[PDB]
Amino acid sequence: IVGGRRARPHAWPFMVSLQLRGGHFCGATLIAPNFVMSAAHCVANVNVRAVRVVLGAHNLSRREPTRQVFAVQRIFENGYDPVNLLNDIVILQLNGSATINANVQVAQLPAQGRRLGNGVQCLAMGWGLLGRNRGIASVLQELNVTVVTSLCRRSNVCTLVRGRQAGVCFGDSGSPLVCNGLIHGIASFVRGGCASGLYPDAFAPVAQFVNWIDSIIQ
Numbered sequence: 001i002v003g004g005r006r007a008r009p010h011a012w013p014f015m016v017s018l019q020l021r022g023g024h025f026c027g028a029t030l031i032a033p034n035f036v037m038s039a040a041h042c043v044a045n046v047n048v049r050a051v052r053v054v055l056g057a058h059n060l061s062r063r064e065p066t067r068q069v070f071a072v073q074r075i076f077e078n079g080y081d082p083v084n085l086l087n088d089i090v091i092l093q094l095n096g097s098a099t100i101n102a103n104v105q106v107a108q109l110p111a112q113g114r115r116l117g118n119g120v121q122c123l124a125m126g127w128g129l130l131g132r133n134r135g136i137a138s139v140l141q142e143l144n145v146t147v148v149t150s151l152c153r154r155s156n157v158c159t160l161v162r163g164r165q166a167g168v169c170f171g172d173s174g175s176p177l178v179c180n181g182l183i184h185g186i187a188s189f190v191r192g193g194c195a196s197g198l199y200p201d202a203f204a205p206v207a208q209f210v211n212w213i214d215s216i217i218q
């Protein structure tokens with residue numbers, strides 16, 4: 001996240017870190033005690049058997065007893081287009097069920113087909129790059145963003161920080177976009193580099209996948 005701020009510890013207990021060899025590479029969202037959702041491109045060219053799903057984290061630089069760690073048991077994708085980044089969403093069943101508590105909670109999702117119009121206010125988040133040559137964030141970052149339809153396509157939810165250069169960045173992919181307390185997006189891609197101030201950020205449109213999600217996580 002470029003130009004955001006530290007989240008308060010465990011402010012977003014649905015926030016998940018996907019890790020390889022003990023290192024964060026993508027966000028995810030806990031959507032049931034034994035399922036998370038992320039961006040399909042996050043798991044595309046990696047050994048999924050080695051992926052660790054880290055719940056309850058805040059500071060990547062610390063050992064945190066609040067953490068619960070799982071592995072991937074099952075993978076669901078529905079028409080993921082790796083070239084155009086269409087349907088960039090994956091559901092990952094975990095090898096067990098999280099203990100639900102203050103620091104580990106399931107997210108709330110929108111109704112199928114629910115559309116946020118140009119102009120709605122949301123919150124992006126993630127442990128991705130803080131900026132060019134600044135590396136990934138130790139502490140979970142969050143960022144006030146605005147849903148926009150300008151420079152967007154129907155198959156994405158797009159957001160922009162109006163008036164300054166800020167946005168999501170590498171390592172933020174897979175992370176939730178929260179609008180009215182509901183997860184309406186999964187970070188997918190930037191254009192013109194991160195925080196260009198020229199192109200909005202693009203999210204997989206969760207609300208287009210709710211029936212499919214419903215069919216899997218129950």
Ligand SMILES: *[C@@H]1O[C@H](CO[C@@H]2O[C@@H](C)[C@@H](O)[C@@H](O)[C@@H]2O)[C@@H](O[C@@H]2O[C@H](CO)[C@@H](O)[C@H](O)[C@H]2NC(C)=O)[C@H](O)[C@H]1NC(C)=O
Nearest residue numbers: 012120121122123124143144145177178179180181182183
């Ligand atoms: C920056 O955003 C925060 C939080 O945004 C709200 O909560 C997000 C998780 C998401 O659901 C968004 O769509 C929401 O808009 C704002 O903090 C809220 O501010 C309102 C108005 O003051 C207040 O009633 C709420 O208590 C706050 N919500 C939370 C979760 O703390 C904040 O106002 C935004 N700042 C600006 C200037 O945009």
Ligand SMILES: *[C@@H]1O[C@H](CO)[C@@H](O)[C@H](O)[C@H]1NC(C)=O
Nearest residue numbers: 052069070071094095096097
């Ligand atoms: C799931 O995998 C993790 C990490 O490899 C392991 O520690 C744990 O035993 C597994 N959990 C369950 C419930 O099988």
